[PDB]
């Protein structure tokens, strides 16, 4: 629309100039949520289910 179009040709150009985030932030998570998945089962049995 506002930029040069591409059905398969512009969507691949976009997914090549910021894939850092949707891989490093969807990763800065997980291990940011790892202290709760286990790591503790005594006092925080609720951190497990969360």
């Amino acid at each position: 629309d506002k930029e040069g179009k591409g059905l398969i040709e512009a969507t691949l150009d976009a997914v090549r100039m910021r894939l850092r985030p949707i891989l490093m932030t969807s990763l800065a998570f997980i291990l940011g949520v790892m202290p709760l998945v286990i790591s503790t089962g005594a006092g925080s049995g609720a951190q497990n289910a969360v």
């Binding site: 100039m17 910021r18 850092r20 932030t25 800065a28 998570f29």
Partner: protein
């Protein structure tokens, strides 16, 4: 989780404008918060959905 995340794009899409297009900062990321403009006012309003 989320509070950590949303802060990366406004720092990573900042890398593009100086690691790719070369030119000096300040007005560098000026037009990159416009690629995520609706991904600001319409991430929250659809995050707020659930």
């Amino acid at each position: 989780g989320l509070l950590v995340d949303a802060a990366i794009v406004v720092v990573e899409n900042v890398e593009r404008v100086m690691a790719e297009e070369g030119l000096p900062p300040k007005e560098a990321t000026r037009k990159s918060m416009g690629q995520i403009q609706g991904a600001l006012v319409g991430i929250a309003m659809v995050l707020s959905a659930v």
